[PDB]
Amino acid sequence: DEVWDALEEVIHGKVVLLNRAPTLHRLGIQAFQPVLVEGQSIQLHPLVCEAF
Amino acid sequence: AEPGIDKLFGMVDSKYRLTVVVAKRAQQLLRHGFKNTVLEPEERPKMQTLEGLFDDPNAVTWAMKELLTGRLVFGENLVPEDRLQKEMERLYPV
Amino acid sequence: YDGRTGEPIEGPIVVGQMFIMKLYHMVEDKMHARSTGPYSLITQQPLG
Amino acid sequence: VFANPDEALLAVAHGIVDLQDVVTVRYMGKRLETSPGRILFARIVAEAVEDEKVAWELIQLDVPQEKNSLKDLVYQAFLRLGMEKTARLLDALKYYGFTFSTTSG
Amino acid sequence: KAPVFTVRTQGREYGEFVLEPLERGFGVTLGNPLRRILLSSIPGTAVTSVYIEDVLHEFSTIPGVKEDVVEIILNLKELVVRFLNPSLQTVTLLLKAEGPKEVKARDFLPVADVEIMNPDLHIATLEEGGRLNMEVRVDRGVGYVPAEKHGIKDRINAIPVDAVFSPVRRVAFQVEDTRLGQRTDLDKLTLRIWTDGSVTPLEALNQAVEILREHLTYFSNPDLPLEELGLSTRVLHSLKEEGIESVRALLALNLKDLKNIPGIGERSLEEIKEALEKKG
Amino acid sequence: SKLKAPVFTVRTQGREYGEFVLEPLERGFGVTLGNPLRRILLSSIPGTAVTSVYIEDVLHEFSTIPGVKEDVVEIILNLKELVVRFLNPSLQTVTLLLKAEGPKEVKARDFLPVADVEIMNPDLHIATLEEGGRLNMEVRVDRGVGYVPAEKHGIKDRINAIPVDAVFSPVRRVAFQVEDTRLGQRTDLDKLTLRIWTDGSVTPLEALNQAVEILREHLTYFSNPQDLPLEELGLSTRVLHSLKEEGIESVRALLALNLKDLKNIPGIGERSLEEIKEALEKKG
């Protein structure tokens, strides 16, 4: 369980890029600050759903 | 949204220049181990661990806040690269 | 009734029995990630 | 006739009036005829952007909020208050929008 | 484990109260009842009625005074009154002013054990030749009671006022996810409380939880009548209202009792005797 | 004008169902009391559930038993419906044994009786057995709260034992009704009626009491506003190893070690007592 805490420490302040095909415009890729969650699914913010 | 992003965009004629300044400053901080910071002990960015408040590992955050303070000077042809690097290594060894 | 508050929903709501199927597309099968790994022979680029 | 928004919404909380009911409410020195709901929307914006006067300027209170009015709101907020504040306002609009959408029936 | 309770307050008007960590679902389980109680059941004071000398009704307008009756009542609704005496349930404030003056809350005639929390509160602007004479009724109560509901009038021409008793102006609560290392589904509760300053947010909260607990405690314990005799009317009324209603009691009435009755004399004694001749 | 303590009425049918009335209450308090109790009753009420299953000559859940109609998955599914009542409050786990054969339909009664263990639903079907069919199994039932999936607890009494999804909550259903009532002068008053359906292991009144107790205990949390390991002490290495492996790992325990305890340790003598004393000189 300590390695998960370590992983929380690692990703601190860093962001990841989300992409959805087809990528029609530059907002087809966006940057998000990741919040670690249980489960195998990626969680996306509602407001960006239109751009993607 | 990143804190004071509009004001940061204010400081530059081009957003990409802001990005370059932030990135390079972050490289300086990483290289010299944060001991060359312009921040004050109470201005230092913090991170909550299980233990408690610790220094923020992220150098980009540091660089952006430092830039927001105004104590940093950025531009083109301010100083030869070698001289800068050596003076920095003299003031803050590795 | 809203289970959180206990107060009812401000309007009447359609409730009934529906037939719903679970499809063959499941996250467990589709979740994947890679740091480093196998590369291609000629291109030396990562595999698919 | 309500002296302030807090009174109107306190009345709504006790089921005296609904959010869609037209009522006389005194807000920012002027006597207005509107629903507690729209006042609530104005407070949502106000707290979201942390500027009450500018928020009051942006909102169209005499009309029901829809896609176009809200889009105009977002744009004006972007022009006046900048990126960060508009983002906060967006999150607020999302939160309260959903919250009311579920209980709406 | 035992959750931490943190309190951050700004003056007497506003407060934030954080409770974490809590078991899943308990955020709203605690959050909802407290919100309901704080808005409804927290004791306070409010202006319930107003009498103005030359004002006939609520929609009238006062000569010499800028504000209409509606605006004046509205300002009086903003009046925060603190009772020092716990047993004191009602006070009548008197106000008399004239001339070119701006009337504040201080101008109200001082009453013992009654403290005005907002003496800077504006009521009405008076001009040259303007005369304002009014009496405001302050009561102790709970929650929000509209004027139409209580309908209390101390005198004629009195205008009933919507009563906002609750010193608590606003209650909001946010519940967000939190983690204890291995478990991530824990609840974090954040309570935001706005008050008028008469009662403190922490005090109000404490009263609310105390009320709720007190409510939780409630689950613990799971020879015939003269009126019919047909005697004289005077006999009926007198004898009846004289504490007796039967011939048995009439029998109990001795010589210094029957004749002692204010109604009874001889005309009555006659009829009575006749009755005792009919029954024996 | 202050309301007084309301009358509380109780109507129970067996151990499975209950109604609890509180009236009169102030307007709006019907749901104020009624709703949170419902949430707690559904979530936080302690109960019993089958946490493990071992069937003889059965290696896993997807196996099949000769002579038995139902598959192992279906058998475990049937076992999930088993309601087990512990009479002893201190009993946190029990292992039930069952042995049956021949042309018989195995019910819950067939389980070998255990002291302080009552089966509330003995009519529950488990498996249909044929001629030559043999069912010999041990199920482990534990006490717990809420819902713990098989993957979460991973309880195995033995190797071939199959972990079972544990549905601990004894409370099957909770509903509450708020109705109009009057106390002579005041109208629009609230009458609260709580209806509770349980599996019989815990009584509706007991469940309600536990719920109210939980709510109260949680309400207490609004009260307050706002001993080190020897291994870390930095003591001598010999001290570390000896003291540690000697059944203690802290200065509290070192303090507990009296004169006829510390000096009794095989490793400890005088060289150790020195360092120890120094440590007690650094902290006091």
PDB file of all heavy atoms in Angstrom, chain D residues 1-4 6-7 10-11 13-14 16 26 31 43 47 95, chain E residues 39-40 68 70-71 74-75 77-78 143-144 146 164 169-170 174:
ATOM      1  N   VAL D   1     -43.236  40.090   0.028  1.00  0.00           N
ATOM      2  CA  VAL D   1     -42.210  41.092  -0.237  1.00  0.00           C
ATOM      3  C   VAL D   1     -41.010  40.858   0.676  1.00  0.00           C
ATOM      4  O   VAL D   1     -41.110  41.003   1.894  1.00  0.00           O
ATOM      5  CB  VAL D   1     -42.743  42.519  -0.013  1.00  0.00           C
ATOM      6  CG1 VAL D   1     -41.632  43.538  -0.215  1.00  0.00           C
ATOM      7  CG2 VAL D   1     -43.909  42.803  -0.949  1.00  0.00           C
ATOM      8  N   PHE D   2     -39.877  40.492   0.082  1.00  0.00           N
ATOM      9  CA  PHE D   2     -38.699  40.102   0.854  1.00  0.00           C
ATOM     10  C   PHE D   2     -37.647  41.202   0.960  1.00  0.00           C
ATOM     11  O   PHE D   2     -37.284  41.831  -0.035  1.00  0.00           O
ATOM     12  CB  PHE D   2     -38.076  38.822   0.289  1.00  0.00           C
ATOM     13  CG  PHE D   2     -38.958  37.615   0.411  1.00  0.00           C
ATOM     14  CD1 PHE D   2     -39.571  37.073  -0.705  1.00  0.00           C
ATOM     15  CD2 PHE D   2     -39.178  37.025   1.643  1.00  0.00           C
ATOM     16  CE1 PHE D   2     -40.384  35.959  -0.593  1.00  0.00           C
ATOM     17  CE2 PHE D   2     -39.991  35.913   1.760  1.00  0.00           C
ATOM     18  CZ  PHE D   2     -40.595  35.382   0.639  1.00  0.00           C
ATOM     19  N   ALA D   3     -37.172  41.429   2.180  1.00  0.00           N
ATOM     20  CA  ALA D   3     -36.141  42.426   2.446  1.00  0.00           C
ATOM     21  C   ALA D   3     -34.820  42.095   1.755  1.00  0.00           C
ATOM     22  O   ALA D   3     -34.116  42.986   1.279  1.00  0.00           O
ATOM     23  CB  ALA D   3     -35.933  42.588   3.945  1.00  0.00           C
ATOM     24  N   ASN D   4     -34.487  40.809   1.710  1.00  0.00           N
ATOM     25  CA  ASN D   4     -33.223  40.360   1.139  1.00  0.00           C
ATOM     26  C   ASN D   4     -33.362  38.962   0.535  1.00  0.00           C
ATOM     27  O   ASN D   4     -34.351  38.275   0.792  1.00  0.00           O
ATOM     28  CB  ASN D   4     -32.135  40.380   2.219  1.00  0.00           C
ATOM     29  CG  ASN D   4     -32.574  39.705   3.503  1.00  0.00           C
ATOM     30  OD1 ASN D   4     -32.584  38.479   3.601  1.00  0.00           O
ATOM     31  ND2 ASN D   4     -32.939  40.506   4.496  1.00  0.00           N
ATOM     32  N   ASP D   6     -31.671  36.187   1.216  1.00  0.00           N
ATOM     33  CA  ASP D   6     -31.634  35.185   2.278  1.00  0.00           C
ATOM     34  C   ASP D   6     -33.016  34.919   2.868  1.00  0.00           C
ATOM     35  O   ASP D   6     -33.344  33.783   3.208  1.00  0.00           O
ATOM     36  CB  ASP D   6     -30.667  35.611   3.385  1.00  0.00           C
ATOM     37  CG  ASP D   6     -29.215  35.421   2.995  1.00  0.00           C
ATOM     38  OD1 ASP D   6     -28.932  35.312   1.784  1.00  0.00           O
ATOM     39  OD2 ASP D   6     -28.356  35.373   3.901  1.00  0.00           O
ATOM     40  N   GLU D   7     -33.826  35.968   2.975  1.00  0.00           N
ATOM     41  CA  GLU D   7     -35.178  35.840   3.505  1.00  0.00           C
ATOM     42  C   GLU D   7     -36.074  35.073   2.542  1.00  0.00           C
ATOM     43  O   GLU D   7     -36.811  34.172   2.948  1.00  0.00           O
ATOM     44  CB  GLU D   7     -35.779  37.218   3.795  1.00  0.00           C
ATOM     45  CG  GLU D   7     -37.057  37.171   4.619  1.00  0.00           C
ATOM     46  CD  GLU D   7     -37.910  38.414   4.448  1.00  0.00           C
ATOM     47  OE1 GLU D   7     -37.344  39.491   4.165  1.00  0.00           O
ATOM     48  OE2 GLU D   7     -39.144  38.317   4.608  1.00  0.00           O
ATOM     49  N   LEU D  10     -35.019  31.511   2.497  1.00  0.00           N
ATOM     50  CA  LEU D  10     -35.405  30.917   3.772  1.00  0.00           C
ATOM     51  C   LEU D  10     -36.887  30.563   3.731  1.00  0.00           C
ATOM     52  O   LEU D  10     -37.314  29.560   4.302  1.00  0.00           O
ATOM     53  CB  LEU D  10     -35.127  31.873   4.933  1.00  0.00           C
ATOM     54  CG  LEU D  10     -35.495  31.370   6.332  1.00  0.00           C
ATOM     55  CD1 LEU D  10     -34.900  29.994   6.588  1.00  0.00           C
ATOM     56  CD2 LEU D  10     -35.048  32.359   7.398  1.00  0.00           C
ATOM     57  N   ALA D  11     -37.667  31.396   3.046  1.00  0.00           N
ATOM     58  CA  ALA D  11     -39.090  31.139   2.867  1.00  0.00           C
ATOM     59  C   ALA D  11     -39.304  29.949   1.941  1.00  0.00           C
ATOM     60  O   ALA D  11     -40.197  29.132   2.164  1.00  0.00           O
ATOM     61  CB  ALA D  11     -39.787  32.370   2.319  1.00  0.00           C
ATOM     62  N   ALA D  13     -37.257  27.494   1.645  1.00  0.00           N
ATOM     63  CA  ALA D  13     -36.844  26.331   2.421  1.00  0.00           C
ATOM     64  C   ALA D  13     -37.980  25.782   3.283  1.00  0.00           C
ATOM     65  O   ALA D  13     -38.044  24.580   3.545  1.00  0.00           O
ATOM     66  CB  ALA D  13     -35.644  26.677   3.289  1.00  0.00           C
ATOM     67  N   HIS D  14     -38.871  26.664   3.725  1.00  0.00           N
ATOM     68  CA  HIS D  14     -39.994  26.258   4.565  1.00  0.00           C
ATOM     69  C   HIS D  14     -41.266  26.009   3.756  1.00  0.00           C
ATOM     70  O   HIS D  14     -42.334  25.772   4.323  1.00  0.00           O
ATOM     71  CB  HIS D  14     -40.252  27.299   5.656  1.00  0.00           C
ATOM     72  CG  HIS D  14     -39.262  27.253   6.778  1.00  0.00           C
ATOM     73  ND1 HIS D  14     -38.976  28.348   7.565  1.00  0.00           N
ATOM     74  CD2 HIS D  14     -38.492  26.242   7.245  1.00  0.00           C
ATOM     75  CE1 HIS D  14     -38.072  28.013   8.469  1.00  0.00           C
ATOM     76  NE2 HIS D  14     -37.762  26.740   8.297  1.00  0.00           N
ATOM     77  N   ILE D  16     -42.972  28.062   1.796  1.00  0.00           N
ATOM     78  CA  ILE D  16     -43.907  29.177   1.703  1.00  0.00           C
ATOM     79  C   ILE D  16     -44.164  29.524   0.242  1.00  0.00           C
ATOM     80  O   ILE D  16     -45.303  29.751  -0.166  1.00  0.00           O
ATOM     81  CB  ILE D  16     -43.381  30.424   2.439  1.00  0.00           C
ATOM     82  CG1 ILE D  16     -42.897  30.052   3.843  1.00  0.00           C
ATOM     83  CG2 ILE D  16     -44.458  31.496   2.511  1.00  0.00           C
ATOM     84  CD1 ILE D  16     -43.974  29.460   4.724  1.00  0.00           C
ATOM     85  N   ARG D  26     -36.112  42.497  -2.674  1.00  0.00           N
ATOM     86  CA  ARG D  26     -35.236  43.664  -2.637  1.00  0.00           C
ATOM     87  C   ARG D  26     -33.768  43.251  -2.696  1.00  0.00           C
ATOM     88  O   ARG D  26     -33.243  42.647  -1.761  1.00  0.00           O
ATOM     89  CB  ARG D  26     -35.512  44.495  -1.381  1.00  0.00           C
ATOM     90  CG  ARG D  26     -34.543  45.646  -1.159  1.00  0.00           C
ATOM     91  CD  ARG D  26     -35.118  46.664  -0.185  1.00  0.00           C
ATOM     92  NE  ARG D  26     -34.166  47.035   0.859  1.00  0.00           N
ATOM     93  CZ  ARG D  26     -34.140  46.489   2.071  1.00  0.00           C
ATOM     94  NH1 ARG D  26     -35.013  45.547   2.394  1.00  0.00           N
ATOM     95  NH2 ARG D  26     -33.240  46.887   2.962  1.00  0.00           N
ATOM     96  N   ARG D  31     -35.776  47.515  -5.834  1.00  0.00           N
ATOM     97  CA  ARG D  31     -36.892  46.604  -5.615  1.00  0.00           C
ATOM     98  C   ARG D  31     -37.249  45.874  -6.905  1.00  0.00           C
ATOM     99  O   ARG D  31     -37.715  46.479  -7.870  1.00  0.00           O
ATOM    100  CB  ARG D  31     -38.104  47.364  -5.070  1.00  0.00           C
ATOM    101  CG  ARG D  31     -39.372  46.534  -4.962  1.00  0.00           C
ATOM    102  CD  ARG D  31     -40.493  47.343  -4.327  1.00  0.00           C
ATOM    103  NE  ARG D  31     -40.056  47.993  -3.094  1.00  0.00           N
ATOM    104  CZ  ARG D  31     -40.804  48.834  -2.386  1.00  0.00           C
ATOM    105  NH1 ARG D  31     -42.034  49.128  -2.784  1.00  0.00           N
ATOM    106  NH2 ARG D  31     -40.323  49.377  -1.276  1.00  0.00           N
ATOM    107  N   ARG D  43     -26.884  34.626  -7.352  1.00  0.00           N
ATOM    108  CA  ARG D  43     -25.985  34.358  -6.235  1.00  0.00           C
ATOM    109  C   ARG D  43     -24.952  33.300  -6.610  1.00  0.00           C
ATOM    110  O   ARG D  43     -23.803  33.364  -6.174  1.00  0.00           O
ATOM    111  CB  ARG D  43     -26.763  33.910  -4.998  1.00  0.00           C
ATOM    112  CG  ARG D  43     -25.908  33.820  -3.746  1.00  0.00           C
ATOM    113  CD  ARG D  43     -26.081  32.485  -3.047  1.00  0.00           C
ATOM    114  NE  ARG D  43     -27.158  32.522  -2.065  1.00  0.00           N
ATOM    115  CZ  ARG D  43     -27.848  31.455  -1.675  1.00  0.00           C
ATOM    116  NH1 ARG D  43     -27.568  30.261  -2.177  1.00  0.00           N
ATOM    117  NH2 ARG D  43     -28.812  31.583  -0.776  1.00  0.00           N
ATOM    118  N   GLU D  47     -21.075  34.316  -6.260  1.00  0.00           N
ATOM    119  CA  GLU D  47     -20.124  33.570  -5.441  1.00  0.00           C
ATOM    120  C   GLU D  47     -19.072  32.875  -6.298  1.00  0.00           C
ATOM    121  O   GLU D  47     -17.918  32.744  -5.889  1.00  0.00           O
ATOM    122  CB  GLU D  47     -20.843  32.547  -4.556  1.00  0.00           C
ATOM    123  CG  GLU D  47     -21.862  33.148  -3.604  1.00  0.00           C
ATOM    124  CD  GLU D  47     -22.316  32.163  -2.544  1.00  0.00           C
ATOM    125  OE1 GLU D  47     -21.938  30.975  -2.633  1.00  0.00           O
ATOM    126  OE2 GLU D  47     -23.049  32.575  -1.622  1.00  0.00           O
ATOM    127  N   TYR D  95     -22.236  22.275 -11.362  1.00  0.00           N
ATOM    128  CA  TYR D  95     -22.662  21.703 -10.089  1.00  0.00           C
ATOM    129  C   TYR D  95     -24.129  21.986  -9.785  1.00  0.00           C
ATOM    130  O   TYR D  95     -24.924  21.061  -9.604  1.00  0.00           O
ATOM    131  CB  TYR D  95     -21.776  22.220  -8.950  1.00  0.00           C
ATOM    132  CG  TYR D  95     -22.166  21.712  -7.579  1.00  0.00           C
ATOM    133  CD1 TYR D  95     -21.698  20.491  -7.114  1.00  0.00           C
ATOM    134  CD2 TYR D  95     -22.987  22.459  -6.744  1.00  0.00           C
ATOM    135  CE1 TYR D  95     -22.047  20.021  -5.862  1.00  0.00           C
ATOM    136  CE2 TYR D  95     -23.341  21.998  -5.490  1.00  0.00           C
ATOM    137  CZ  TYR D  95     -22.867  20.779  -5.055  1.00  0.00           C
ATOM    138  OH  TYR D  95     -23.215  20.314  -3.807  1.00  0.00           O
TER     139      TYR D  95
ATOM    140  N   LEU E  39     -32.170  26.019  10.199  1.00  0.00           N
ATOM    141  CA  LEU E  39     -33.030  26.999   9.545  1.00  0.00           C
ATOM    142  C   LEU E  39     -34.374  27.150  10.253  1.00  0.00           C
ATOM    143  O   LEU E  39     -34.967  28.229  10.250  1.00  0.00           O
ATOM    144  CB  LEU E  39     -33.245  26.639   8.073  1.00  0.00           C
ATOM    145  CG  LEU E  39     -32.032  26.805   7.156  1.00  0.00           C
ATOM    146  CD1 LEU E  39     -32.349  26.320   5.750  1.00  0.00           C
ATOM    147  CD2 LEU E  39     -31.573  28.255   7.136  1.00  0.00           C
ATOM    148  N   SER E  40     -34.849  26.066  10.857  1.00  0.00           N
ATOM    149  CA  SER E  40     -36.178  26.051  11.462  1.00  0.00           C
ATOM    150  C   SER E  40     -36.194  26.232  12.981  1.00  0.00           C
ATOM    151  O   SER E  40     -36.890  27.107  13.497  1.00  0.00           O
ATOM    152  CB  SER E  40     -36.922  24.765  11.083  1.00  0.00           C
ATOM    153  OG  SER E  40     -36.283  23.625  11.630  1.00  0.00           O
ATOM    154  N   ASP E  68     -41.574  54.665   1.653  1.00  0.00           N
ATOM    155  CA  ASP E  68     -42.952  54.224   1.820  1.00  0.00           C
ATOM    156  C   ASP E  68     -43.027  53.228   2.970  1.00  0.00           C
ATOM    157  O   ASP E  68     -41.999  52.794   3.487  1.00  0.00           O
ATOM    158  CB  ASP E  68     -43.494  53.588   0.539  1.00  0.00           C
ATOM    159  CG  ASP E  68     -42.520  52.614  -0.087  1.00  0.00           C
ATOM    160  OD1 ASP E  68     -41.336  52.622   0.305  1.00  0.00           O
ATOM    161  OD2 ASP E  68     -42.946  51.812  -0.944  1.00  0.00           O
ATOM    162  N   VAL E  70     -43.894  50.147   2.989  1.00  0.00           N
ATOM    163  CA  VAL E  70     -43.304  48.874   2.588  1.00  0.00           C
ATOM    164  C   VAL E  70     -41.799  48.834   2.845  1.00  0.00           C
ATOM    165  O   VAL E  70     -41.286  47.871   3.416  1.00  0.00           O
ATOM    166  CB  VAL E  70     -43.574  48.572   1.099  1.00  0.00           C
ATOM    167  CG1 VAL E  70     -42.944  47.247   0.701  1.00  0.00           C
ATOM    168  CG2 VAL E  70     -45.069  48.559   0.822  1.00  0.00           C
ATOM    169  N   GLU E  71     -41.096  49.880   2.418  1.00  0.00           N
ATOM    170  CA  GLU E  71     -39.651  49.959   2.608  1.00  0.00           C
ATOM    171  C   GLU E  71     -39.279  50.043   4.087  1.00  0.00           C
ATOM    172  O   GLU E  71     -38.287  49.456   4.517  1.00  0.00           O
ATOM    173  CB  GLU E  71     -39.077  51.164   1.860  1.00  0.00           C
ATOM    174  CG  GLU E  71     -37.564  51.305   1.957  1.00  0.00           C
ATOM    175  CD  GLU E  71     -36.822  50.187   1.248  1.00  0.00           C
ATOM    176  OE1 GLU E  71     -37.380  49.611   0.291  1.00  0.00           O
ATOM    177  OE2 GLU E  71     -35.675  49.891   1.644  1.00  0.00           O
ATOM    178  N   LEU E  74     -39.680  46.718   5.532  1.00  0.00           N
ATOM    179  CA  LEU E  74     -38.550  45.953   5.009  1.00  0.00           C
ATOM    180  C   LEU E  74     -37.280  46.179   5.827  1.00  0.00           C
ATOM    181  O   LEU E  74     -36.567  45.230   6.154  1.00  0.00           O
ATOM    182  CB  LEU E  74     -38.300  46.313   3.543  1.00  0.00           C
ATOM    183  CG  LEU E  74     -38.563  45.208   2.516  1.00  0.00           C
ATOM    184  CD1 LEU E  74     -39.798  44.402   2.892  1.00  0.00           C
ATOM    185  CD2 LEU E  74     -38.706  45.797   1.122  1.00  0.00           C
ATOM    186  N   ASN E  75     -36.996  47.437   6.148  1.00  0.00           N
ATOM    187  CA  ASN E  75     -35.844  47.769   6.982  1.00  0.00           C
ATOM    188  C   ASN E  75     -35.996  47.235   8.400  1.00  0.00           C
ATOM    189  O   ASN E  75     -35.026  46.789   9.013  1.00  0.00           O
ATOM    190  CB  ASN E  75     -35.610  49.282   7.010  1.00  0.00           C
ATOM    191  CG  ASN E  75     -35.211  49.836   5.658  1.00  0.00           C
ATOM    192  OD1 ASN E  75     -35.842  50.757   5.140  1.00  0.00           O
ATOM    193  ND2 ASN E  75     -34.156  49.275   5.077  1.00  0.00           N
ATOM    194  N   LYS E  77     -37.511  44.593   9.135  1.00  0.00           N
ATOM    195  CA  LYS E  77     -37.283  43.156   9.021  1.00  0.00           C
ATOM    196  C   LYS E  77     -35.808  42.820   9.211  1.00  0.00           C
ATOM    197  O   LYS E  77     -35.455  41.697   9.569  1.00  0.00           O
ATOM    198  CB  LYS E  77     -37.772  42.627   7.671  1.00  0.00           C
ATOM    199  CG  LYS E  77     -39.282  42.523   7.540  1.00  0.00           C
ATOM    200  CD  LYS E  77     -39.672  42.010   6.164  1.00  0.00           C
ATOM    201  CE  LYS E  77     -41.182  41.899   6.019  1.00  0.00           C
ATOM    202  NZ  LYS E  77     -41.575  41.397   4.673  1.00  0.00           N
ATOM    203  N   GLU E  78     -34.952  43.807   8.968  1.00  0.00           N
ATOM    204  CA  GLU E  78     -33.511  43.620   9.074  1.00  0.00           C
ATOM    205  C   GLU E  78     -33.018  43.888  10.495  1.00  0.00           C
ATOM    206  O   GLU E  78     -31.840  43.707  10.800  1.00  0.00           O
ATOM    207  CB  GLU E  78     -32.782  44.510   8.066  1.00  0.00           C
ATOM    208  CG  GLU E  78     -33.183  44.244   6.619  1.00  0.00           C
ATOM    209  CD  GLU E  78     -32.037  43.738   5.766  1.00  0.00           C
ATOM    210  OE1 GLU E  78     -30.871  43.865   6.193  1.00  0.00           O
ATOM    211  OE2 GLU E  78     -32.303  43.220   4.661  1.00  0.00           O
ATOM    212  N   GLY E 143     -38.002  29.804  13.338  1.00  0.00           N
ATOM    213  CA  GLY E 143     -38.252  29.637  11.916  1.00  0.00           C
ATOM    214  C   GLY E 143     -38.715  30.887  11.194  1.00  0.00           C
ATOM    215  O   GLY E 143     -38.347  32.005  11.558  1.00  0.00           O
ATOM    216  N   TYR E 144     -39.529  30.693  10.159  1.00  0.00           N
ATOM    217  CA  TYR E 144     -40.049  31.802   9.367  1.00  0.00           C
ATOM    218  C   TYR E 144     -41.572  31.738   9.301  1.00  0.00           C
ATOM    219  O   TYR E 144     -42.138  30.821   8.707  1.00  0.00           O
ATOM    220  CB  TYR E 144     -39.460  31.769   7.955  1.00  0.00           C
ATOM    221  CG  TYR E 144     -40.029  32.814   7.020  1.00  0.00           C
ATOM    222  CD1 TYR E 144     -39.600  34.132   7.078  1.00  0.00           C
ATOM    223  CD2 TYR E 144     -41.000  32.483   6.083  1.00  0.00           C
ATOM    224  CE1 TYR E 144     -40.116  35.092   6.228  1.00  0.00           C
ATOM    225  CE2 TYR E 144     -41.523  33.436   5.228  1.00  0.00           C
ATOM    226  CZ  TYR E 144     -41.077  34.739   5.306  1.00  0.00           C
ATOM    227  OH  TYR E 144     -41.594  35.692   4.459  1.00  0.00           O
ATOM    228  N   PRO E 146     -44.864  33.828   8.055  1.00  0.00           N
ATOM    229  CA  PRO E 146     -45.447  34.929   7.279  1.00  0.00           C
ATOM    230  C   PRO E 146     -46.502  35.694   8.074  1.00  0.00           C
ATOM    231  O   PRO E 146     -47.096  35.141   9.000  1.00  0.00           O
ATOM    232  CB  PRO E 146     -46.099  34.214   6.091  1.00  0.00           C
ATOM    233  CG  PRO E 146     -45.383  32.911   5.986  1.00  0.00           C
ATOM    234  CD  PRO E 146     -45.045  32.527   7.390  1.00  0.00           C
ATOM    235  N   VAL E 164     -39.196  36.779  10.562  1.00  0.00           N
ATOM    236  CA  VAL E 164     -38.026  35.935  10.369  1.00  0.00           C
ATOM    237  C   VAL E 164     -37.343  35.752  11.717  1.00  0.00           C
ATOM    238  O   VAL E 164     -36.492  36.553  12.106  1.00  0.00           O
ATOM    239  CB  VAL E 164     -37.029  36.584   9.398  1.00  0.00           C
ATOM    240  CG1 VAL E 164     -35.879  35.632   9.102  1.00  0.00           C
ATOM    241  CG2 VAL E 164     -37.731  36.982   8.114  1.00  0.00           C
ATOM    242  N   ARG E 169     -29.116  32.859   9.026  1.00  0.00           N
ATOM    243  CA  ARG E 169     -29.498  33.386   7.723  1.00  0.00           C
ATOM    244  C   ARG E 169     -29.385  32.343   6.615  1.00  0.00           C
ATOM    245  O   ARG E 169     -30.222  32.297   5.715  1.00  0.00           O
ATOM    246  CB  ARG E 169     -28.687  34.638   7.377  1.00  0.00           C
ATOM    247  CG  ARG E 169     -28.879  35.782   8.360  1.00  0.00           C
ATOM    248  CD  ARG E 169     -28.623  37.129   7.705  1.00  0.00           C
ATOM    249  NE  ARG E 169     -28.959  38.238   8.595  1.00  0.00           N
ATOM    250  CZ  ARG E 169     -30.190  38.705   8.775  1.00  0.00           C
ATOM    251  NH1 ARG E 169     -31.211  38.162   8.126  1.00  0.00           N
ATOM    252  NH2 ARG E 169     -30.402  39.718   9.605  1.00  0.00           N
ATOM    253  N   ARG E 170     -28.354  31.507   6.679  1.00  0.00           N
ATOM    254  CA  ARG E 170     -28.152  30.511   5.630  1.00  0.00           C
ATOM    255  C   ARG E 170     -27.397  29.271   6.105  1.00  0.00           C
ATOM    256  O   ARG E 170     -26.526  29.354   6.968  1.00  0.00           O
ATOM    257  CB  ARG E 170     -27.434  31.148   4.434  1.00  0.00           C
ATOM    258  CG  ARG E 170     -27.219  30.213   3.255  1.00  0.00           C
ATOM    259  CD  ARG E 170     -27.307  30.958   1.940  1.00  0.00           C
ATOM    260  NE  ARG E 170     -26.136  31.794   1.694  1.00  0.00           N
ATOM    261  CZ  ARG E 170     -25.133  31.454   0.892  1.00  0.00           C
ATOM    262  NH1 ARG E 170     -25.158  30.290   0.254  1.00  0.00           N
ATOM    263  NH2 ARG E 170     -24.105  32.276   0.723  1.00  0.00           N
ATOM    264  N   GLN E 174     -21.536  20.642   1.954  1.00  0.00           N
ATOM    265  CA  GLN E 174     -20.896  19.916   0.863  1.00  0.00           C
ATOM    266  C   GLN E 174     -20.307  18.615   1.392  1.00  0.00           C
ATOM    267  O   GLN E 174     -19.642  18.606   2.423  1.00  0.00           O
ATOM    268  CB  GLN E 174     -19.782  20.764   0.239  1.00  0.00           C
ATOM    269  CG  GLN E 174     -19.305  20.269  -1.119  1.00  0.00           C
ATOM    270  CD  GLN E 174     -19.607  21.247  -2.238  1.00  0.00           C
ATOM    271  OE1 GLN E 174     -20.140  22.331  -2.002  1.00  0.00           O
ATOM    272  NE2 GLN E 174     -19.278  20.862  -3.466  1.00  0.00           N
TER     273      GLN E 174
END
